[PDB]
Design a protein around this ligand. Structure first.
Ligand SMILES: *[C@@H]1O[C@H](CO)[C@@H](O[C@@H]2O[C@H](CO)[C@@H](O[C@@H]3O[C@H](CO[C@H]4O[C@H](CO)[C@@H](O)[C@H](O)[C@@H]4O)[C@@H](O)[C@H](O[C@H]4O[C@H](CO)[C@@H](O)[C@H](O)[C@@H]4O)[C@@H]3O)[C@H](O)[C@H]2NC(C)=O)[C@H](O)[C@H]1NC(C)=O
Ligand SMILES: *[C@@H]1O[C@H](CO)[C@@H](O[C@@H]2O[C@H](CO)[C@@H](O[C@@H]3O[C@H](CO[C@H]4O[C@H](CO)[C@@H](O)[C@H](O)[C@@H]4O)[C@@H](O)[C@H](O[C@H]4O[C@H](CO)[C@@H](O)[C@H](O)[C@@H]4O)[C@@H]3O)[C@H](O)[C@H]2NC(C)=O)[C@H](O)[C@H]1NC(C)=O
Ligand SMILES: *[C@@H]1O[C@H](CO)[C@@H](O[C@@H]2O[C@H](CO)[C@@H](O[C@@H]3O[C@H](CO[C@H]4O[C@H](CO)[C@@H](O)[C@H](O)[C@@H]4O)[C@@H](O)[C@H](O[C@H]4O[C@H](CO)[C@@H](O)[C@H](O)[C@@H]4O)[C@@H]3O)[C@H](O)[C@H]2NC(C)=O)[C@H](O)[C@H]1NC(C)=O
Ligand SMILES: *[C@@H]1O[C@H](CO)[C@@H](O[C@@H]2O[C@H](CO)[C@@H](O[C@@H]3O[C@H](CO[C@H]4O[C@H](CO)[C@@H](O)[C@H](O)[C@@H]4O)[C@@H](O)[C@H](O[C@H]4O[C@H](CO)[C@@H](O)[C@H](O)[C@@H]4O)[C@@H]3O)[C@H](O)[C@H]2NC(C)=O)[C@H](O)[C@H]1NC(C)=O
Ligand SMILES: *[C@@H]1O[C@H](CO)[C@@H](O[C@@H]2O[C@H](CO)[C@@H](O[C@@H]3O[C@H](CO[C@H]4O[C@H](CO)[C@@H](O)[C@H](O)[C@@H]4O)[C@@H](O)[C@H](O[C@H]4O[C@H](CO)[C@@H](O)[C@H](O)[C@@H]4O)[C@@H]3O)[C@H](O)[C@H]2NC(C)=O)[C@H](O)[C@H]1NC(C)=O
Ligand SMILES: *[C@@H]1O[C@H](CO)[C@@H](O[C@@H]2O[C@H](CO)[C@@H](O[C@@H]3O[C@H](CO[C@H]4O[C@H](CO)[C@@H](O)[C@H](O)[C@@H]4O)[C@@H](O)[C@H](O[C@H]4O[C@H](CO)[C@@H](O)[C@H](O)[C@@H]4O)[C@@H]3O)[C@H](O)[C@H]2NC(C)=O)[C@H](O)[C@H]1NC(C)=O
Ligand SMILES: *[C@@H]1O[C@H](CO)[C@@H](O[C@@H]2O[C@H](CO)[C@@H](O[C@@H]3O[C@H](CO[C@H]4O[C@H](CO)[C@@H](O)[C@H](O)[C@@H]4O)[C@@H](O)[C@H](O)[C@@H]3O)[C@H](O)[C@H]2NC(C)=O)[C@H](O)[C@H]1NC(C)=O
Ligand SMILES: *[C@@H]1O[C@H](CO)[C@@H](O[C@@H]2O[C@H](CO)[C@@H](O[C@@H]3O[C@H](CO)[C@@H](O)[C@H](O)[C@@H]3O)[C@H](O)[C@H]2NC(C)=O)[C@H](O)[C@H]1NC(C)=O
Ligand SMILES: *[C@@H]1O[C@H](CO)[C@@H](O[C@@H]2O[C@H](CO)[C@@H](O[C@@H]3O[C@H](CO)[C@@H](O)[C@H](O)[C@@H]3O)[C@H](O)[C@H]2NC(C)=O)[C@H](O)[C@H]1NC(C)=O
Ligand SMILES: *[C@@H]1O[C@H](CO)[C@@H](O[C@@H]2O[C@H](CO)[C@@H](O[C@@H]3O[C@H](CO)[C@@H](O)[C@H](O)[C@@H]3O)[C@H](O)[C@H]2NC(C)=O)[C@H](O)[C@H]1NC(C)=O
Ligand SMILES: *[C@@H]1O[C@H](CO)[C@@H](O[C@@H]2O[C@H](CO)[C@@H](O[C@@H]3O[C@H](CO)[C@@H](O)[C@H](O)[C@@H]3O)[C@H](O)[C@H]2NC(C)=O)[C@H](O)[C@H]1NC(C)=O
Ligand SMILES: *[C@@H]1O[C@H](CO)[C@@H](O[C@@H]2O[C@H](CO)[C@@H](O)[C@H](O)[C@H]2NC(C)=O)[C@H](O)[C@H]1NC(C)=O
Ligand SMILES: *[C@@H]1O[C@H](CO)[C@@H](O)[C@H](O)[C@H]1NC(C)=O
Ligand SMILES: *[C@@H]1O[C@H](CO)[C@@H](O)[C@H](O)[C@H]1NC(C)=O
Lengths: 50, 601, 600, 50
C-alpha cells in the first residue's frame, strides 16, 4: 500500500509489459512489476532456467 | 568457497509473490561470497529466510525494502565492500519494511557480525516496527565516520530497552545480541582495527572488520589482496630491484594478481601485463602469444582497430547495442568487451527518445574477428532469418561471462538457421540456445569441437524438433563431415571431407582437366602460377605454386624458373628455339643473338 | 647523512705507517654511512682514532686485523649489512690486534650500539689482551646465528669482571657500557625486535636493530627501502591493479625505486624501467628518450649489441682489459660498463698465467661509439703515442664513477697527443689527466663544452709545458676555431672557421673547379646531382643537393630533373637538349609531335 | 710481528714493487706493503691526489 501508479508521461519507463509504480516517498523512486518471463529494473531482460 | 553472482534490479520485482520468493532462493541459497548486490524486496510474512545465514561477504550494496517478514537472518554477514552504492550513496539501505494497513513488518536485524562497510554510507529509514537498529554506533562500522557523510539512521517507540550488561548499542532484546566495537575502542598508537582496548591487542593494517591476533594470517576479512591466507597491499612481482647493483633481478616467489587473489599462473584466455592478469590491454599496445602465453607489447605505426564493447570504456553506461551507439562500431575488428542485443536496442526505447535500429546499420559487425567477452542475443529484427552479419567472427574469448555463459540465444521465432561461418573457438564459458521454435541446424553441430577445456557444456532445451526438420529436408550438404554445419550451404560446414577451395567445400580440384589448373594437399586446393601451360589427356599440370613446379610454361625457361622475356633489361641474355634463356657476352644490353660479342649490335 | 666510500685493501698497506694512518683519515673522517667496507689495518698504539665515532652504518664488512690500539671507537655503529663479506664468510672480523713483544693491544671494543648484523658470521680471535668479548650475546645481534653461519669468539689472557647490574654480558667494566638485547628477550606475540620484553613494547616487522615506538617511521635502522621516512618492503608503483575491474590504473602516488630510496625523479643518465631506475637496460629492449626521461622498450629485428664492460655482466670477476677478454670487443659499438687498462692487463700477469696484450689487439675498440661507465687508463703500450684506437668514441655515460671521475688518465710517458675525432659529450663525473710529461695538446681544449652541467670539472697538472710544446711546433691546424683541438691534423679540431668535407676541415670547396661539384652550407659543403654541368669561370651550378636544383645539366632536361635517357608516350630531345612528348601512339623512338615523326 | 715473508713460489702475487708477506695464523693469509704511489690488495692501482 506504499505505491501508486505511474502518470501517463512516466508509464513508458517499464518495457516488456511490466506495470509501472512510483513510491509515495518524497526525490521519489520508480519500480515496476514484471511478467514471469522478464526481469531487470525496467523488465528489459528474460528470466532463465537451467 | 561458494560464490554467487547476485542481482542488479534495484526495487523492481516479479508481479507474482510466489515466484519472487522462489527467485530469491535460486540466487542466494548455499553461497558465502555475493558478487554484485544482495537485495531483498517485497517478501511476504511467515516465509522461511534461514538460507540467507550462509552469506559472509557482499561486494556491492545490501538493499532491504518493502518486505513484510519479522526478522532479517544475515547472522554471519561480516563485511560489505560497497563497490557499487544504492542511489550512488548508500552501501546498506533498509526502508519501508511494514504494512500500514495492519501490524506486519521488520522488527529485528540479525546483523551482529557486521563490523565493516568500506565505501558509501548507511540508510535505515521509515521502518515502523524496528526496535534496536536506532541504538547502534554506526560510526564503528563505516570507513567514513561522520553524521553528514551519506548516512541517515531514523522506528516507533514502546519496544523494550537493551540488556543490562550493555551500554545501549545492541541488535536484540537480550544477552549475546550486543554490538562489538572494533575501531572506536583502540589505543591511540594503533592503525586500522583491534580486538581489545590495549595497544598489545591491535590488528595488522590490512585486516577488515575484526581479528584474533596481530598476524596478517589471523583475521576475519581482508582488504586489497589475499596471498594464500596472508592479507597484503600487493603480491611479490616477477622482478625485485637490487638496491646495491642498481638493476632489476628475477624473483623466485613471484605471483600474478587475479582480482582479489594471487595465483601462480593466469587463466588461458587472459593477457599478462606487469605481473598481473587483466581482461584487456591498453590501445597503444598489441596482444601477442609467445610460448602459449598471452602478453602485451607496443604496436607498430599501423596496428589493429581495438574497439569498446557494451559495459566498458566509452560505452560503460550502455546496456545494449542500439540506434545511438551502432555508428561507433563501423571499422572495428576486435571488441574489448561484451556484445549485447536487448529488446530496447532493436525495437527502440521511447522513454529515452531512442528510435528502433535500421536492420542495415547492423552490417557494421561484418568486419569483427574477435569478441573478448560474451555474445548475448535476446532480440533480432523480425525480417532477418539468420546471424550471417557475424560470418567473419572467429573467436569468442569468454573473459567476461553472463552467469557462466559465453554464447546466449533466447526466444527468437524469426530465425531458421544460425549461419556463422568463420567461428572456430569459444575459449571459455557455456553455450545456451533455447526457445527458437523455427531454428533447425542446431542439432547437427559437434559443439564439443569449439571448446578449449573439458569444463564447457551446451544447453539445448526447446528449439524446433530435429525429426520434423529432417522430414522437411532441413539438412546439410552431402560433402560435409560428421562434425556438422551452420546452415544448408557448401561453405557453411564446421569441417568437410575431400577438399576445399577457400571457404567452399568440393569433391575434387581438376588437376588434369577444366578451365583452371591448381595443386592440392591436406584437403586444401591452391591455384598454380598462371604462366604454366595447361596439361591435357589425363596429365597432371602442377605439383606446387612455383613456375619450377609445373610440366611446362609459355614463358621462357631460365634455369628451373620461367621468365616473360630474358632479353628485357639486365649481365644480358638471349633465348633459343626451345624457349630456354642463355647468357650473352657483356656490353650487349642493346641486343644480341647468341653466347658471344660477334652477334651483338 | 654524510656518505663516504670504503677501501678494498683488506690486510695490505703502504710501507710508511704514517701514510697508512693519513689515508685512513681521508677515507673515513666526517662520514656516517660507509657504502662499502670498513677496514682498519696496521695502525700504531700512539695514534688518535676518535674520528671513527661518526660512523653509524656499514654496507660491507668490518675488518680490524693487525692494529696495536687499546680501544675501538665505534660505540654508535648500529647496523652492518654484509653486502660483501671478509673471506666470503664474515661481516665482522677482529683478530691479531696485539704486540707479541710487550703488553700493547686491543683491550675493549667500543660497540655498545652494534645491534643488527643482517648477513655473514662474526669472528673474534687471537686478540691476546682483549677483556670482555666472550660475554657478548652475539646470537641476539646476528641474524640467523647458529654454528653453521660462523658465530664465534675465542682473547687468551685473564681480565677483571664487569658490574653485576649487567648479569655477565658486557663491553667494558661499567654498567654504562654493557649488552642490550632486542631479539631474544621479546614476547612470543611479536616478530622482529623490541624495546622491552612486553608485547606493547615491540616494534614494526620491517625495522632493524631497535626502535623508539611501534611505527615504521620511529625505528633506528632498516633492511628495506626508505619511503620518505618509512621503512617498507616495496613502495607505490606507476600502476595499481583494480581487483573489481581486472585492469591496471595509473597511480597518482607513484614513486621510482633508486638504490635504497624511493624518489620522485631519477638521474639524467639512468634508464627508467618498471617504476625503478637502473644502470643499464636488459638486452631484450632498446634504450630511448621521451620528454627528457630515458626509458627502454622491446626492440625490432636489429638491436644494440649485448657487449659488457669491466666489472659488470659477463666480466664481473675482471678488473682490467687483458689478453684473456679483449677479443669480446671485436664487433662492439656500445660497451655496457667500464673500460679499465691496468699494468697487469697491458703487460700481463705472470701469477695468473695471463699474457701481455699485443698492441694490434687494441684495434677491436675502434668500433666503439659509447661507454656507459667510466674510462680509466693507467697503462698503454710503450710503442703508442696517442689514443687513436678510440677515434670514433662519441660519449662517456658516467652512470658509474671511479672516486667521482668518469675519465681518468694517469702517468703515461710514450704519449704526445690524444687524436680523438668523434667525442662530443661526457654526461656525468669529473676529468683527471695528470703526470703525462710528454703530452702537449691538452692545453688547446675548451674542456667545459664536453660537460652536461656546471657541476663537472677537469683537473690538469704536471703534463708537458705548453710553452715548450709551442716552441717545438706541436700545434693544431691553422683552420681551428676557439672550441679547441687535440692533434696536428686538419681532422683533429673540434670545430673550424671555414668549410669541411667528411672529417677534414678545408680552405675551399669544389664549387667552380674539380671533377665533382659541391654546394655551400653553414660549416660543410656537399656534392650535388652528378648530372649537373661542371661550368667554368665561377659560374656555379650546385645550390642544393636535388636534381631539380641544378641551373644547367649535361644530360637531357625535363620539368622536375635531368635524365641520361627520356621515357619510352615517348619523349624526344630538341636542339637545346630538352625532351618533349611525341604522337600518343608512338613509344619506340621519335623526333616530332605527330604520327610521321615516330622512329624505330 | 705476526707476519713472515712469502716464499719465492708466490713471487708476483704483489706487483709494482710491493713486498709480499704471509700472516702466521692457520688457511694462511697473504698481504703486501708497497710504495706510496700504489694501492689495492696486490698494489696494482695508482694512488691518486690533488
Ligand atoms: C561471526 O564471525 C566469527 C568470526 O568469523 C565466527 O566465529 C567462528 O566460527 C567458526 C566456524 O563458523 C570457527 O571455526 C572453527 O573453529 C574450530 C575451533 O578452533 C580452535 O582453534 C583456533 C586456532 O586458530 C582458535 O582460533 C579457536 O578459538 C579455537 O580454539 C576449528 O576446530 C574448526 O576447524 C576444524 O573443522 C572444520 C569443519 O569444516 C574443518 O574444515 C577444519 O579442517 C578443522 O578440522 C573451525 O576453524 C571460528 O574458530 C570462530 N572464531 C572465533 C574467533 O570464535 C562466527 O561463527 C560468526 N557468526 C556468528 C553468528 O557468531
Ligand atoms: C584467504 O584465502 C584463503 C584461500 O587461499 C581462504 O581460505 C578459505 O577458508 C574457508 C574457511 O574460512 C574455507 O571454507 C570452508 O571449507 C571447508 C572445507 O572444504 C574444503 O576442503 C574439503 C576437503 O575434503 C573439500 O572437499 C572442499 O571442496 C573444500 O576444498 C568446508 O567444509 C566449509 O563449508 C561447510 O560449512 C558451510 C557453513 O559454514 C556450509 O554452507 C557448507 O555446506 C559446508 O558444510 C567451507 O567451505 C575455504 O575452503 C578456504 N579456501 C581455500 C581455497 O582454501 C581465506 O578465507 C581467505 N581469507 C580472507 C580473510 O578472505
Ligand atoms: C617446387 O615443388 C617443391 C615440392 O615438390 C617445393 O619444395 C618444398 O618447399 C617447402 C617450402 O615451401 C620445403 O619446406 C621447408 O624445408 C626445409 C628443409 O627441411 C626439409 O628438407 C631436409 C633435406 O635434407 C630434411 O632433412 C628435413 O627433414 C625436411 O624434410 C625446412 O627447413 C623448413 O621448415 C623448418 O625450418 C624453418 C626455418 O625458418 C622453420 O620456420 C620451420 O618451423 C621448420 O623448423 C620447411 O619444412 C620443402 O622441404 C620442399 N620440398 C622438397 C621436396 O624439396 C618447391 O619449393 C617448389 N618451388 C617453388 C618455387 O615453389
Ligand atoms: C646509540 O644510538 C642511540 C639511538 O639511536 C643514539 O641516540 C640518539 O642521539 C641523538 C643525538 O642526541 C638524538 O637526536 C636528537 O633528538 C632530539 C629529539 O628528542 C629525542 O629524545 C626524547 C627524550 O629525551 C624523545 O622523546 C624523542 O623521541 C627523541 O628521541 C632532537 O631535539 C635533536 O635535534 C637537535 O640536535 C641535532 C644534532 O645534530 C640538530 O641538528 C638539531 O638542529 C637540534 O638542535 C636530535 O635530533 C636521537 O634521538 C637519539 N636517539 C634515541 C632513540 O635516543 C646514540 O647517539 C648512539 N650512541 C652514541 C654513543 O652516540
Ligand atoms: C630515511 O631518509 C631520511 C631522509 O633522507 C633520513 O633523514 C635524515 O636524518 C638524519 C639524522 O638521522 C639527518 O642527518 C643529520 O642532519 C643534521 C642536520 O639536520 C637539519 O637540516 C635538515 C635539512 O637539511 C632538516 O630536515 C633537519 O630538521 C635539521 O634542521 C646534521 O647536523 C647532522 O650532521 C652533524 O652531526 C653528525 C653527528 O655524527 C656529524 O658527524 C656531522 O659532521 C655534523 O656535525 C646529520 O647530517 C639527515 O639530514 C636527514 N635527511 C633529511 C633529508 O632530512 C632518515 O634517517 C632515513 N632513515 C630512516 C630510518 O628514517
Ligand atoms: C636549391 O636548394 C635550396 C636548399 O639548399 C633550396 O632552398 C629552399 O628554400 C625554401 C624557402 O625559400 C624552403 O622552403 C621552406 O621550408 C620550410 C621547412 O619545411 C620543412 O619542415 C616543416 C616542419 O613542420 C614540414 O612541414 C615541411 O614539410 C618540410 O619538411 C617551410 O616552413 C616553409 O614553408 C613556408 O613557406 C612557403 C613558401 O611557399 C609557404 O607556402 C608556407 O605556407 C610557409 O609559410 C618552406 O616550405 C626549402 O625547404 C628549401 N629547400 C631545401 C632543400 O633546403 C632552393 O629553393 C633550391 N633551388 C632550386 C632552384 O630549386
Ligand atoms: C663481425 O661482423 C661481421 C659482419 O659485419 C661478421 O661477418 C664477416 O663479414 C665480412 C664482411 O662482410 C665477410 O667477408 C666477406 O665475405 C664475402 C663472401 O661471403 C660468402 O662466402 C662465404 C664462404 O665461406 C660464406 O660463408 C658467406 O655466407 C657468403 O656466402 C666476400 O665476397 C667479401 O669480399 C668479404 O670477404 C665475412 O665472410 C663475414 N664472416 C662470417 C663468418 O660470416 C664477422 O664474423 C664478425 N666478427 C666477429 C669476430 O664476430
Ligand atoms: C566430435 O568431435 C570430437 C573431437 O574430434 C570427436 O571425438 C573423438 O572421438 C574418437 C572416437 O571415439 C576418439 O578416438 C579414440 O581415441 C582413443 C584415445 O585413447 C583411442 O584409444 C581410440 O582407438 C580412438 O582413436 C578421439 O580421441 C575423440 N577426440 C577427442 C578430442 O575427444 C567426436 O567423435 C565427434 N563427434 C561426432 C558427432 O562425430
Ligand atoms: C599444402 O600444405 C601447406 C603446408 O605445407 C599448406 O599451407 C600451410 O597452411 C597452414 C594453415 O593450414 C599454415 O599454418 C599457419 O600459419 C599461420 C601464419 O600466420 C599461423 O598463425 C598458424 O598458427 C599456422 O601455423 C602454414 O603456414 C602454411 N604453410 C605454407 C608453406 O604456406 C597448404 O594449405 C596445403 N595446401 C595447398 C594446396 O597449398
Ligand atoms: C669555451 O666555451 C665556453 C662555454 O660555451 C664559451 O663561453 C661563452 O663566451 C661567449 C663569448 O664571451 C658568451 O657569449 C656572449 O659574450 C659577449 C662578449 O663577447 C657578452 O657580451 C654576452 O653577454 C654573452 O656573454 C657565452 O655566454 C659564453 N658561454 C658560457 C656558457 O659561459 C667560450 O667562449 C669558449 N671558448 C673559450 C676560448 O673560452
Ligand atoms: C646543411 O647543414 C645543416 C646543419 O647546419 C644540416 O641540417 C641538419 O640535418 C640533420 C640531418 O640528419 C639533422 O639531424 C637530426 O638528428 C636527429 C637526432 O635525434 C634526428 O631525430 C632527426 O631526424 C635529424 O636527422 C639536424 O637537426 C639538422 N640541423 C639543423 C641545424 O637543422 C643539413 O643537413 C646540411 N645539409 C647537407 C646537404 O648536408
Ligand atoms: C717500438 O718497439 C720496438 C721493438 O718492437 C723498439 O725498437 C727496439 O728498441 C731497442 C731499444 O734498446 C733497440 O735496441 C732495438 O734495436 C729496436 N729495434 C728495432 C727493430 O728498431 C722501439 O723502441 C719501440 N718504440 C717505443 C716508442 O716504445
Ligand atoms: C512439425 O511440422 C508441422 C508442419 O506442418 C507442424 O504442423 C507441427 O506442429 C510440427 N511439430 C513439431 C513437434 O515440431
Ligand atoms: C723547454 O724549452 C726551453 C727553451 O725555450 C729549454 O731551455 C728547456 O730545456 C725545455 N725544457 C725541457 C724539459 O725540454
Amino acid at each position: 500500500s506504499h505505491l501508486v501508479k505511474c502518470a501517463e508521461k512516466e508509464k513508458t519507463f517499464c518495457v516488456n509489459g511490466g506495470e509501472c509504480f512510483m513510491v509515495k516517498d518524497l526525490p521519489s523512486r520508480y519500480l515496476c512489476k514484471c511478467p514471469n518471463e522478464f526481469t531487470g529494473d525496467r523488465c528489459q531482460n528474460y528470466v532463465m532456467a537451467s | 568457497q561458494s560464490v554467487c553472482a547476485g542481482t542488479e534490479n534495484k526495487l523492481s520485482s516479479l508481479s507474482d509473490l510466489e515466484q519472487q520468493y522462489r527467485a530469491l532462493r535460486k540466487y542466494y541459497e548455499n553461497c558465502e561470497v555475493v558478487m554484485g548486490n544482495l537485495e531483498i524486496t517485497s517478501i511476504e510474512h511467515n516465509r522461511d529466510l534461514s538460507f540467507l545465514r550462509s552469506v559472509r561477504e557482499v561486494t556491492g550494496y545490501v538493499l532491504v525494502a518493502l518486505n513484510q517478514f519479522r526478522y532479517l537472518p544475515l547472522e554471519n554477514l561480516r563485511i560489505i565492500r560497497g563497490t557499487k552504492l544504492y542511489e550512488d550513496r548508500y552501501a546498506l539501505a533498509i526502508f519501508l519494511n511494514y504494512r500500514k494497513d495492519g501490524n506486519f513488518g521488520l522488527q529485528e536485524l540479525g546483523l551482529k557480525n557486521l563490523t565493516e562497510i568500506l565505501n558509501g554510507g548507511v540508510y535505515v529509514d521509515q521502518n515502523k516496527f524496528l526496535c534496536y537498529a536506532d541504538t547502534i554506533h554506526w560510526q564503528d562500522i563505516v570507513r567514513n565516520p561522520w553524521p553528514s557523510n551519506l548516512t541517515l539512521v531514523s522506528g516507533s517507540s514502546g519496544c523494550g530497552r537493551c540488556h543490562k550488561s550493555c551500554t545501549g548499542r545492541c541488535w536484540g532484546p537480550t544477552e549475546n545480541h550486543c554490538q562489538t566495537l572494533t575501531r572506536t575502542v583502540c589505543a591511540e598508537q594503533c592503525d586500522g582495527r583491534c580486538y581489545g582496548p590495549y595497544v598489545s591487542d591491535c590488528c595488522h593494517r590490512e585486516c577488515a572488520g575484526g581479528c584474533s591476533g596481530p598476524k596478517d594470517t589471523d583475521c576475519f576479512a581482508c582488504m586489497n589482496f589475499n596471498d594464500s591466507g596472508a592479507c597484503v597491499t600487493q603480491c611479490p612481482q616477477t622482478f625485485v630491484y637490487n638496491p646495491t647493483t642498481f638493476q632489476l633481478e628475477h624473483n623466485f616467489n613471484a605471483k600474478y594478481t587475479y582480482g582479489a587473489f594471487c595465483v601462480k599462473k593466469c587463466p588461458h584466455n587472459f593477457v599478462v601485463d606487469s605481473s598481473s592478469c587483466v581482461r584487456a590491454c591498453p590501445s597503444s599496445k598489441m596482444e601477442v602469444e609467445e610460448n602459449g602465453i598471452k602478453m602485451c607489447k607496443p604496436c607498430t605505426d599501423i596496428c589493429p582497430k581495438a574497439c569498446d564493447g557494451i559495459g566498458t570504456g566509452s560505452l560503460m553506461s550502455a546496456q545494449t547495442v542500439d540506434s545511438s551507439n551502432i555508428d561507433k562500431f563501423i571499422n572495428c575488428t576486435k571488441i574489448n568487451g561484451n556484445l549485447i542485443f536487448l529488446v530496447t536496442g532493436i525495437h527502440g526505447d521511447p522513454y529515452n527518445a531512442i528510435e528502433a535500429i535500421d536492420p542495415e546499420k547492423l552490417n557494421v559487425f561484418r568486419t569483427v574477428r574477435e569478441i573478448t567477452g560474451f555474445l548475448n542475443i535476446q532480440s533480432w529484427p523480425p525480417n532477418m532469418t539468420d546471424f550471417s552479419v557475424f560470418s567473419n567472427l572467429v573467436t569468442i574469448g569468454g573473459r567476461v561471462l553472463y552467469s557462466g555463459l559465453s554464447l546466449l540465444i533466447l526466444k527468437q521465432q524469426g530465425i531458421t538457421s544460425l549461419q556463422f561461418q568463420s567461428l572456430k573457438e569459444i575459449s571459455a564459458g557455456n553455450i545456451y540456445i533455447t526457445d527458437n521454435s523455427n531454428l533447425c541446424y542446431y542439432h547437427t553441430i559437434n559443439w564439443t569441437t569449439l571448446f578449449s577445456t573439458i569444463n564447457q557444456r551446451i544447453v539445448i532445451r526447446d528449439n524446433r524438433k530435429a525429426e520434423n526438420c529432417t522430414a522437411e529436408g532441413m539438412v546439410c550438404n552431402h560433402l560435409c563431415s560428421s562434425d556438422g554445419c551452420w546452415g544448408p550451404g557448401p561453405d557453411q560446414c564446421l569441417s568437410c571431407r575431400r577438399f576445399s577451395r577457400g571457404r567452399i567445400c568440393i569433391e575434387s580440384c581438376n588437376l588434369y582437366d577444366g578451365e583452371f589448373r591448381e595443386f592440392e594437399n591436406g584437403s586444401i586446393c591452391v591455384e598454380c602460377d598462371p604462366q604454366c601451360e595447361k596439361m591435357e589427356d589425363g596429365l597432371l599440370t602442377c605439383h606446387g605454386p612455383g613456375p619450377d613446379n609445373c610440366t611446362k610454361c609459355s614463358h621462357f625457361k631460365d634455369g628451373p624458373n620461367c621468365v616473360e622475356k630474358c632479353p628485357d633489361g639486365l649481365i644480358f641474355k638471349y633465348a633459343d628455339p626451345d624457349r630456354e634463356c642463355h647468357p650473352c657476352h657483356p656490353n650487349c644490353t642493346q641486343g644480341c643473338n647468341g653466347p658471344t660479342s660477334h652477334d651483338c649490335i
